[PDB]
Symmetry: D2
Subunit: 185 residues, 4 copies
């Protein structure tokens, strides 16, 4: 099931174009599962833009929209940029990083990128034990101990393709920067 | 708990203004629970506008946004018109009918208007028995036999204040018109 | 789907023998869904025996074990009498009424007897609206407004085969007696 | 929250007597969460007896009844031995090991012994990733990545008080013996 190399992976962006992970060689990669109508939407989306603009050549920031966490991404793929631009964050917000087509990160149909990353990094560094306060919010099947717990978990991979660290829903995106710098030395 | 008269009810619109149901005397009233990012959002929103424009003086159409059904209204109150205008239906869509502040229609905190209507009209005329295929989508407490089953159930009340009929999630909004005409004779 | 006559129904008892509902002609019938390890197990089981012994020829009491309500019947069919005899009620308790093989009363695989009865009697007389306080306890699919709400709902059918009344989880079995007498006049 | 030493723990047996974990010094300890009406009840209960009889002085086998997994322990404490003796396994079965009072192993009210053990041994050795196929069976709060996954997970602790290994719902009790022998060398 699981990719042998990070670089064997791929994804489809919102324009239907393939994102080939071979293009990530020599670059640090930040992957987050994202949601357009989450409580931390505005903050994480602003901070994802900031990070990508700070490291425009040496970092790839990639966001995977997902509706598994409080159903906070009910948009069709063709509606997501509109919602970000006009609703939340709103105010003309546009992503400067790559958003991919909506996927599942947990369960039987989880995206191969997330199967791979959860296998390499089975829990968040900052909060290894929490999964969910309200068990009703676990809606996928099967449920595994390594599952993404909410919108905006974060996976940092180094420039040689080795996943480095996973960060929880409570770990601010912008606070990943010191580890990005370290990996880019 | 339950209002003695339909006309004793009220609601708050999205601008924070009170909608006093006494203003509905002599008018037929169509109340739907609505959601901005539902599969039948575009159709019901278009059809609600059409009905209100067809009966601008003799009908009040009132929509209650609610996030209890697949969490298909995660917008804050101040984001709902933007989402309708720019996302879904999109294309500059504006409601011609009154939208109220987001509420709960089922459970312990259900809006007084819905407590009243479900009491007068405990099941949909066209589908009295269905409640939910997937029991995981029942997220409120307590659960009652008269509960709203999904986004866009419909309650028609006559010009003398007596609730007349309830219609299910599958009953098209525009197909309520013959009953509106009948009640307005 | 639904039987045309009450008398077209049947069930299999714990000894694997067919219970043909034609044998109920001219008799009142009390049907309950039962559970061996419920909070009201001892009371309802004692009261079901008492009623059957009071009307040994003119009443049939029939209990349908079911595991859909808090999973309070996990016994295999061959373990149920042992559990009643030695655990709860315990003390050598034996049913004087007919127990049938464990079934489902709600959802896609609901027993034909319960499909029929819920159709004729879609809510409890004494409590028409309650379904469930904790939505997590609704575990079947699909969920319908007429569904059995907990262990020990009660359905009384008259001697000419017409279902008469349904009673809720809170209505004591022994309090059905006045209606049995009335139906037997 | 978590005990500093395994030996600081205690439990109450079914007779209401304190089981002081200081009495476990110099002994290997096998702790399982158990259920009287599970699919693996007969096998695990037979195998728990066998292990205790094989190491009557050097091993303590301790079973914690728990109703969190398919509600397969609905018995009151005073009914459990009867159910084991007369229902399942039945046939006069009596435990030769210590059963404690029914508890919760997961969530806010989890037993201190299980808080301690899941902290020392956060996943099963033989199956580190599985948690639950059907998310509806996760009924406790909060849900943590280290949670017990079903009836009959197994925790082996060495004679000096250091938890050694955790085994999953699919790992046979009797197959823990080689590790018991190793710990007792
Ligand atoms: Cl750069
Ligand atoms: Cl690397
Ligand atoms: Cl008009
Ligand atoms: Cl009227
Ligand atoms: Cl008689
Ligand atoms: Cl009759
Ligand atoms: Cl020994
Ligand atoms: Cl040790």
């Amino acid at each position: 099931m699981i990719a042998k190399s990070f670089y064997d992976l791929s994804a489809i962006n919102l324009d239907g174009e393939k994102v080939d992970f071979n293009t990530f060689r020599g670059r640090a990669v930040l992957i987050e599962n994202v949601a357009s109508l989450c409580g931390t939407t505005t903050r994480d989306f602003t901070q994802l833009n900031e990070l990508q603009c700070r490291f425009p050549r040496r970092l790839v920031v990639l966001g995977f929209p997902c509706n598994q966490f409080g159903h906070q991404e009910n948009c069709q793929n063709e509606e997501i940029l509109n919602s970000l631009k006009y609703v939340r964050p709103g105010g003309g917000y546009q992503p400067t990083f790559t958003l991919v087509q909506k996927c599942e990160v947990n369960g039987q149909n989880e995206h191969p990128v997330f199967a791979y990353l959860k296998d390499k990094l089975p829990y968040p560094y900052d909060d290894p034990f929490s999964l969910m306060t309200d068990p009703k919010l676990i809606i996928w099947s099967p449920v595994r101990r390594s599952d993404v717990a909410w919108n905006f978990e974060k996976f940092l991979i180094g420039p040689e393709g080795e996943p480095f660290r996973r960060y929880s829903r409570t770990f601010p995106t912008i606070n990943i920067e010191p580890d990005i710098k370290r990996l880019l030395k």
